[PDB]
Amino acid sequence: TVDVGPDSVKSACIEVDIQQTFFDKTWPRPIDVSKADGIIYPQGRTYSNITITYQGLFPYQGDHGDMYVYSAGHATGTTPQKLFVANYSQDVKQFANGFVVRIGAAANSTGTVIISPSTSATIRKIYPAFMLGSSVGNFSDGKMGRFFNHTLVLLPDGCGTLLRAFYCILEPRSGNHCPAGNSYTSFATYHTPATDCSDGNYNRNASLNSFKEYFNLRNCTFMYTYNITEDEILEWFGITQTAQGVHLFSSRYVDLYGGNMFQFATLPVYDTIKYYSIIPHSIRSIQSDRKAWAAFYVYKLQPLTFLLDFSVDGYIRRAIDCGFNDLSQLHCSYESFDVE
Amino acid sequence: YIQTTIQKVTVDCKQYVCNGFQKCEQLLREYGQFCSKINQALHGANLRQ
Amino acid sequence: LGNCVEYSLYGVSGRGVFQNCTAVGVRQQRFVYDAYQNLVGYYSDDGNY
């Protein structure tokens, strides 16, 4: 067991307003394998200026994945009222191979806020939060989405400057608007950009404290932290699991203007992850000061065979999914990008 | 009688070896480019014919 | 450089001749292979390819 800090001093955790209708939209960003989208680089080696077939864990060509949006909270003038979240916490999915996430795709563009449909704004990259586990059941009122004995958790903090991963067994707290308490809707994290998002010092525990208000981290295990440099560039994040633990991938430390994902961490999680879920996150900003947070897309991974093209610098700039259609099968059979 | 051709035959290597069963497909997938060589040889023979 | 030597680099062992050349591939994956799984490059700790 490892020390993570003090528990929450507040008893009444904040209220969250679930309205799935505001978040139910369409923004198609299918996997385009012709520009090597969501490709995890072969994690033993590298090549130069060739084209080869390779068996690994890739997503389906043309897959649409699942979209998720994060929204600001309710605020009257200069006072955030409550949190605006979707029902993601109730939506438990299967892990079964891992997945990849496309973060910041719709950046440097003009979109709209979620809680204010008639409000144009420039979109800002935001980072997702995941909670993965080995056993899932119901909450206090039979609400789906409770995670048992050990739950790996990945959550960004400090206005998207760092990422933290930990076991930290979850213990639902009993109080107002809280999981184990009365009048429970959904747990969620939050950060107030008025105070926490200070240029001099970004509070690196704001989201951790928000999470602490709903759960009591007990018998906690490894609590790492990885530093992220701010920008508005599209990036990729992958996660798989083997006998060596849980592998974490990203394209920030090696390929930043590309997207090829390289391993950057390994976790001592040796229990078989069978379920995962997104963690909702609302921004307690001022009603007159709200931004648009780019949606992120999650695509599953499968044991497929791909035709990858490595360039001179060793990066995969294009690939072909051998099992997509008949032309793809022809391309892979000759293992070339030009078929007579 | 002077023969000039033979019958042109192509086989579907994947379906001949496994005939639809998904379990056999994964087992054959790690055999790599055998079926591809068979298909390319047959295609070349038919083109020459 | 120029002599046939035995090598053991980070658990990859064999026998060959090393030489100085312009870097290819990606640096973080020090071992550079070719199409047929033969090591053809190495990113040394000294900062050379």
Question: Topology, please?
Answer:
This is part of a larger assembly, with three copies of chain A.
Chain A: E1 16-18, H1 20-23, E2 50-58, E3 66-68, E4 74-75, E5 80-85, E6 93-94, E7 99-103, E8 110-112, E9 120-124, E10 130-133, E11 136-138, E12 144-147, E13 151-157, E14 162-166, E15 189-191, H2 206-214, E16 226-227, E17 235-242, E18 245-250, E19 262-267, E20 275-278, E21 281-283, E22 292-293, E23 296-300, E24 302-310, E25 316-321, H3 326-333
Parallel strand pairs in A: 1-5, 9-22, 15-21
Antiparallel strand pairs in A: 2-24, 3-23, 4-5, 6-20, 7-17, 7-23, 8-9, 10-13, 10-20, 11-12, 13-14, 14-16, 17-18, 18-19, 24-25
Can you offer a commentary on this structure?
The structure is cut from a larger assembly and holds three copies of chain A. Chain A is mainly beta and 340 residues long. Helix content of chain A is 6%, strand content 34%. Chain A has helices spanning 20-23, 206-214, 326-333; strands at 16-18, 50-58, 66-68, 74-75, 80-85, 93-94, 99-103, 110-112, 120-124, 130-133, 136-138, 144-147, 151-157, 162-166, 189-191, 226-227, 235-242, 245-250, 262-267, 275-278, 281-283, 292-293, 296-300, 302-310, 316-321. In chain A, strands 3-23-7-17-18-19 form a six-stranded antiparallel sheet, with no helix packed on it. In chain A, a hairpin with a 7-residue loop joins strand 8 (110-112) and strand 9 (120-124). The first copy, chain A, is globular, with a radius of gyration of 21 Å. At the A-B interface, loops of A face helix 3 of B.
